[PDB]
Amino acid sequence: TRDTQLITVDEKLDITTITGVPEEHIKTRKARIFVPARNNMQSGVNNTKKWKMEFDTRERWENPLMGWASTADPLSNLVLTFSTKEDAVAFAEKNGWSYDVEERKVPKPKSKSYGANFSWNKRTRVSTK
Amino acid sequence: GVRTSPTGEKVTHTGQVYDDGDYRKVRFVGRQKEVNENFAIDLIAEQPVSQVGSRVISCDGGGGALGHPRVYINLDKETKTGTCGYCGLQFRQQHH
Amino acid sequence: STSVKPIFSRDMNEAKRRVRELYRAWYREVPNTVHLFQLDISVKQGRDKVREMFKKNAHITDPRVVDLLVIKGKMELEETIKVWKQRTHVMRFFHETEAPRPKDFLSKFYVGHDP
Amino acid sequence: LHHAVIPHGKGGRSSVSGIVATVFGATGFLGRYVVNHLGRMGSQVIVPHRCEPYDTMHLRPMGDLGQIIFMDWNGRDKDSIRRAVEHSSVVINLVGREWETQNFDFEDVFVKIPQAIAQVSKEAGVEKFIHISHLNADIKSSSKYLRSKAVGEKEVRETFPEATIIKPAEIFGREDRFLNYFANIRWFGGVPLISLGKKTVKQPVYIVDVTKGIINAIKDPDARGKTFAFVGPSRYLLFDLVQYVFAVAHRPFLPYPLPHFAYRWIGRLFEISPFEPWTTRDKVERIHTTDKILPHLPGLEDLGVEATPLELKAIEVLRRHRTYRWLSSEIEDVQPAKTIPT
Amino acid sequence: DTRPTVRPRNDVAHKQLSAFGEYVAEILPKYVQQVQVSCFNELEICIHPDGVIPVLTFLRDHSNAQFKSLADLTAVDIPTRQNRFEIVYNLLSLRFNSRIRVKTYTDELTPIESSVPVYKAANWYEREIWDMFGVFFANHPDLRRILTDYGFEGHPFRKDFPLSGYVELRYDDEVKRVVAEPVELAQEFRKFDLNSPWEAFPAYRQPPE
Amino acid sequence: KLGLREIRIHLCQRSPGSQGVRDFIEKRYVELKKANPDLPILIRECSDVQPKLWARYAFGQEKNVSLNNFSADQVTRALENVLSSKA
Amino acid sequence: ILPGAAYTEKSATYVNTEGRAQQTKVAVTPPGLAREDWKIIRALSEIAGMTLPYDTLDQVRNRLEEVSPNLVRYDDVEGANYFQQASELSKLVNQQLLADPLVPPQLTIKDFYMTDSISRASQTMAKCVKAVTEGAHPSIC
Ligand SMILES: NC(=O)C1=CN([C@@H]2O[C@H](COP(=O)(O)OP(=O)(O)OC[C@H]3O[C@@H](n4cnc5c(N)ncnc54)[C@H](OP(=O)(O)O)[C@@H]3O)[C@@H](O)[C@H]2O)C=CC1
Ligand SMILES: [Zn+2]
């Protein structure tokens, strides 16, 4: 066993005071924990295998000089990747953020028969091939 | 070509012009507004339509490797000219 | 599940001894900071800022988190004493160039979309 | 106030405050703080300057890219004034001089230039006009500076009725002519004072207080057509105010009375300088003029600004005037001056 | 092995490092948790954080190890783990002309034993880890910020720290000073989603769900 | 006016702690609606919710009475305490 | 006229035809001085002296849980029962059916491209309607 002379601490992990984040960005925020949806323009499913944590979108305005998109939100480009939902929830509660969790959406298994394309008495017969 | 809105500010080739009440015009007071006077839309329209005796013609933009990727253009449709998607040159089929 | 290596303290009683010790060190160093840095504030203002910073973290009950706060606070004191900080860094605790942001719902409603 | 003039951001340097301001006389004392505050919130500032561009350089950091625009103007050229205000929603007039030059008299800069700017602003459709008068302005003063201020304050009302006229007292700050003027008297041994400074009462105000009041007047819609009196929280005797100045600076204080006529003759001698005069006959009158008590005019508190006491912000102005022996002396070392309770 | 565009594979070194990996594990079963050799012939020893001093001291002093140069010490932040941080030691052996990697872990609140007694080079590397990651090292001579500004709040290299930070500096003329204010960007940093939705390397595929 | 303006009944479709309210609705709601034709009686069923009876009076005043583990007869008596007092 | 936010500019709850509660997410902020719809009423209540008891979106959704708990069960369909009770109460009053036949308001696809403020303000829906009535009477890249 260990010989580091451990101690017992029984209280929820909380590091909001030592992360250095300002107050306005710990209490007014809302972290969305979700599995990204498939980009419908493609068939690949490799981007829908890890959980992500993105924050709520704040104001973007137009730079008066060049018309660029200006922001005052330091967390507008912050995306974190987690292997599991419980890992994401643990990180959110550790840093004091409020979070909403979206349960994973998995495509349901489907019965696909090529022989149904040519059916004697069913509407699945295809008029073209 | 380069136009001028009622306030006298030249309109760019992208159609940009500050309105009468726009304070951002103040940036040109004592200076000039840089407008390119060689409108591409006008110049490309000056080029003649080339006559080609084939269904399919190819354009690389001229110059070979100094042009654009070589694409092939279909000329079957007789009610319009075939246009290159990179350089804008037009082609037509000789008497169909 | 609850067994963890401590940093310096084994319980809050041991951790609060370091906190009070740190407050004494900061309390005695404000008069010199206002002197060496030629700050245009008074000792009362500076010592009230030290008290404010300690009060922000008065809701902590984890001896390991308190130890980090004391360790971080001790590093801040070291820089001030040795004049590694400049007048700009010391005066960054006061936010003298920021207009006071609104706190009530109506004031925030008028000026923007933030909660 | 079309789409481009709708506020955006969180009041930072890269935000859009919706303010398009033309600040005349922005290269001086009260003009560097106004531009600084306007550019802190992301305002479009037009800065028409008469001087060399080298003297406008301290104003360039005060705004994000493209926010501070510099134009060249002439007080007697009505076309230059129009180029600098026709795109602005608020015009701020800070033009002034504490002396008279060969080319511009007191009534040229306090009566004619203020009236020319006001007229062109109204003809150009400007919505807000802010004019800085003086607290002690009246037609029957001993100073042309104050006599001309009263006249100018009246021409502006007749030309721009919705103007917001502000009447500050003597302003103390870093680049000021009030606390620095008294401290620099040490070169001449003693400190002359008319009646030994026992019959003059002054109520100086802080530069940031005046700067925050002007900004608030722009954003407050009820400040139109209302005359404000920006004064400090405490009234002092000139002898006590100057004595406190030499106490903070730790310089020997050797006052001696001087007849009013004698102080004018001395001032006449200093006026011959072809550069910024050290003192003029007009400054002597202004320094020894009791600050008016105008209870009928709204003050700083009516614009949401808490007047800063002189004591809290006098060391920052006068620490520069101390020797190495007394540079490090703390704020809490000099006892505060004696105030005149109501 | 004649293919011009494919890196040649050195199997002699792969064998030698695997043998030395078992050698270390057999000698230090109390701390060694995992040993592996990459396809490019690099050896990694994964240890319990309580074995930082024993494991490093053995590798530095042992006759058949003689890892007398600390090439680098660094941390990696992986938020998905309970112990989000991963302290990495790279050691160089001049006698045997070989390199080894020692890896451990810690969370935000658990201290890690300082390596200064073994390698003096670790003095400044551990300040960087504390500065840029917030990992506390016990028994360090002088633990301070080494790279960030004075009074800087936050540990930048944490994955949850924003790229542009929370504060920015400018010169303010009113206070004749350099001041810090909340960050505002004239042009926001544009975030690109570049990952292809098609798997690139089947050999590294993970078991489903 | 101090009269009643709305009644809302919250209950779960399966929990044993909401059986009384379900018994009330299955047999008595039809009668209590015919006796109060112009009184909105909202019956909102969720999953795993403690039963409650909300009563919104004039000018936004709302009072709620917990109906957890109540029998079919207490629920009937609880409503009568709301449709009669009109506080 | 009090400007508000569109569905792409607020985090708002909509219940579809099957009783499923779902919430939008803020994509872009409202254009100019426009504000979130529930904040305008909250601001109006405070000025009128009848301040509502919620200041933040999470508190407004707590109120929704009071009025109808199903409104805060996102992506969940809560079964509704008591069809028998509805049938009984429906037979108390006997209304007659008008002789006029049932005719949906949208007979053809040209009635489908414009049904609300957003679609009637769209220049693509205006092209679609023109395309399905007048027909198709230059794409290169
Ligand atoms: N003690 C005080 O400071 C008081 C100030 N005021 C008033 O506030 C305003 C500014 O005061 P302050 O900043 O202290 O004085 P400054 O001398 O520091 O500023 C004067 C400004 O006005 C310009 N100016 C002067 N004459 C002309 C002219 N003929 N043509 C064009 N510009 C001219 C100057 O331009 P440039 O520098 O390029 O030559 C400069 O920008 C003035 O109206 C003043 O009367 C009123 C009460 C108290
Ligand atoms: Zn081409």
From the CA of D99, how far away is ligand 1's center (Å)? Answer: 10
- Which atom of ligand 1 lies at the shortest distance from residue D133's CA? 46
| D30 within ligand 1 shell (Cβ under 6 A) | yes
F–G interface: beta-carbon pairs under 8 A: 42
**Chain G residue with Cα closest to F28:** G85
Report how this structure was experimentally obtained: cryo-EM
Q: What is the spatial distance between Cα D110 and Cα F40, in angstroms, rounded to a whole number? A: 74
The ligand 1 atom nearest the CA atom of D98: 17
Element (H, E) at D45: strand D44-49
Q: Which two tokens stand for residue A118?
A: 């040519």
Measured from the Cα of D27, ligand 1's closest atom is 41
Architecture of domain F4-83: 3-Layer(aba) Sandwich (3.40)
Report which of D313, D183, D67, D10 is spatially closest to residue E176, judged by C-alpha positions: D313
Phi-psi region of B15 (alpha: psi -120 to 50; beta: other; left: phi over 0): left
The full length of chain B comes to 96
- Taking a C-beta distance cutoff of 8 angstroms, is the pair D138, D150 a contact? yes
Q: Establish if A17 touches chain E: CB-CB under 8 angstroms.
A: no
DSSP-assigned states of every residue in E69-116: EEEEEEEEE-TTSSS-EEEEEEEEETTTTEEEEEE--B-SS--EE--T
- Which letter does DSSP use for residue G20 in this model? B
Residues of B in contact with G138 (CB under 8 A): 80, 83
Ligand 2 centroid to Cα of residue B56, in Å, is 14
Residue owning the nearest CA to atom 21 of ligand 1: D25
Q: How many beta-carbon pairs below 8 A join chains D and G?
A: 3
Q: Tell me the sheet residues that pair with A61.
A: A70
Measured from the CB, is residue D24 less than 6 Å from ligand 1? Answer: no
For testing contact with chain C, the best of D16, D17, D172, D331 (most C CBs within 10 A): D331
Residue E189, chain D, CB below 8 Å: the answer is: no
Q: Is D34 in the pocket of ligand 1 (CB under 6 A)?
A: no
CB contact under 8 A, C35 and D332: no
Q: Do chains G and F touch (3 or more CB pairs under 8 A)?
A: yes
Ligand 1 pocket residue status of D209, Cβ below 6 Å: no
Residue of A nearest to E209 (CA): A49
Task: State in Å: Cα D30 to ligand 1 middle.
Answer: 7
Asked if residues A29 and A22 have their Cβ atoms less than 8 Å apart, the reply is no
Q: Is the CB of D337 under 6 A from ligand 1?
A: no
Note down the domain range covering C6: 1-115
Residue nearest to atom 42 of ligand 1 (CA): D96
Tell me which chain C residue has its CA closest to the CA of residue D8: C112
DSSP single-letter state for residue E29: T
Distance of CA F67 to the CA centre of its chain: 9
Check if the beta carbon of residue C113 is closer than 8 Å to that of residue G29: yes
Phi, psi of C103 (to 5 degrees): -115, -30
Counted domains in chain C: 1
- Among E166, E179, E184, E189, most D C-beta atoms within 10 A, so best to mutate, is E184
D263/D261 Cα distance (integer angstroms): 5
| Contact (CB<8Å) G26/A32 | no
D6 and D16 in contact (C-beta within 8 Å)? yes
Q: Give nearest CA residue, ligand 1 atom 16.
A: D28
Q: After which residues is chain A broken (C to N over 2.5 A)?
A: none
According to DSSP, the β-strands at F62-66 and G13-15 are unpaired
Give me the residues paired with residue E113 across strands: E138
Q: Are strands D20-24 and D90-93 parallel, antiparallel or unpaired?
A: parallel
Tell me if residue F16 falls in helix, strand or coil.
Answer: helix
The label of the residue with tokens 């506080």 reads F87
Query: Is D84's C-beta closer than 6 angstroms to any atom of ligand 1?
Result: no
Count of domains for chain D: 1
Candidates E60, E32, E174; CA nearest to E122 is E60
For ligand 1, whether the C-beta of D70 sits within 6 Å is no
Q: Are D35 and D58 in contact (CB under 8 A)?
A: no
Contact state of A59 with D67 under an 8 Å Cβ cutoff: no
Q: Give contacts of F44 with chain G, Cβ < 8 Å.
A: 67-70
* Residue whose CB lies within 8 A of the most ligand 1 atoms, among D27, D36, D49, D51, for a mutation test: D27
Give D233's DSSP letter: S
Element (DSSP H or E) covering residue E56:
helix E52-61
For residue G141, the chain B residue with the least C-alpha distance is B85
Residues of D in contact with G33 (CB under 8 A): 6
Across the interface, whether the CB atoms of C114 and A10 are under 8 A apart is answered no
Q: Does the beta carbon of C115 lie under 8 angstroms from any beta carbon of chain G?
A: yes
G36: chain C residues, CB-CB within 8 Å? 113
Taking the C-alpha atoms of residue E204 and residue F16, their distance in angstroms, rounded to an integer, is 50
For D59-100, strand residue ranges (E) read 68-72, 90-93
In B, which residues are within 8 Å of D20 by CB distance? Answer: 23, 26
Contact of D36 with D29, CB cutoff 8 Å? no
CA-based end-to-end distance of chain B: 34
> Are the beta carbons of C99 and D315 separated by less than 8 Å?
no
3-state secondary structure of D27: coil
Q: What is the per-residue DSSP string for chain B?
A: --EE-TTSPEEPTT-----TT-GGGGGGTTS--------HHHHHHHSPPEEESSSEEEE--SSGGGS---EEEE---SSS-EE-TTT--EEEETT-
In short, whether D134's Cβ falls inside 6 Å of ligand 1 is yes
| Interchain contact, C88 vs E109, CB within 8 Å | no
Chain D partners within 8 Å of A72 (Cβ):
9-10, 12, 14-15
Contact by Cβ (8 Å): B74, B67: no
Q: Which has the closest alpha carbon to D106: D149, D77, D138, D73? A: D149
Instruction: Tell me the CA–centroid distance for residue D28 and ligand 1, in Å.
Output: 6
- How many Å apart are CA G83 and CA E171, to the nearest integer? 72
With 0-12 CB in 10 A as exposed, 13-18 as middle and 19+ as buried, what is D95?
buried
Residue to substitute from E50, E126, E179, interface C, most C β-carbons within 10 A: E179
Task: Say how many Å lie between the CA of residue D96 and the centre of ligand 1.
Answer: 3
Q: Which two tokens stand for residue D129?
A: 């006009």
How far from each other are the two terminal CA atoms of chain F, in whole angstroms? 10
- Compute the count of residue pairs across chains A and D with CB atoms less than 8 Å apart: 27
| Chain C, nearest residue to A6 by Cα | C5
- Judged by its nearest atom, the ligand closest to the C-alpha of residue D230 is 1
Residue D78 CB: number of other CB atoms within 10 A?
A: 13
Tokens of D336: 């505060």
For A14-33, the DSSP string reads --TTTS---THHHHS--EEE
Closest ligand 1 atom to Cα of D26: 41
Token pair 């870093």 in the structure block, residue: D174
Please state whether at least 3 CB pairs lie below 8 Å between chains E and F: no
The burial class, CB within 10 Å (0-12 / 13-18 / 19+), for D144 is middle
Cβ contact C–G (≥3 pairs, < 8 Å): yes
Distance CA E43, CA E36 (A): 6
User: How far does residue B39's CA lie from ligand 2's centre (Å)?
Assistant: 18
Q: If you measure from the C-alpha of residue D94 to the centroid of ligand 1, how many angstroms do you get, rounded to a whole number?
A: 6
Q: What is the DSSP letter of D8?
A: B
Ligand 1 pocket, mutate which of D33, D94, D211 (most atoms under 8 A from CB): D94
Interior/surface letters G80-110, b for 16+ CB within 10 angstroms, e for the rest: eeeeebeeeeeeeeeeeeeeeeeeeeeeeee
Alpha-carbon gap: D137 to the closest alpha carbon of chain A (Å): 41
Which stretch of DSSP H or E encloses residue F10? Answer: strand F4-12
CA-to-CA distance for E112 and E138, rounded, in angstroms? 6
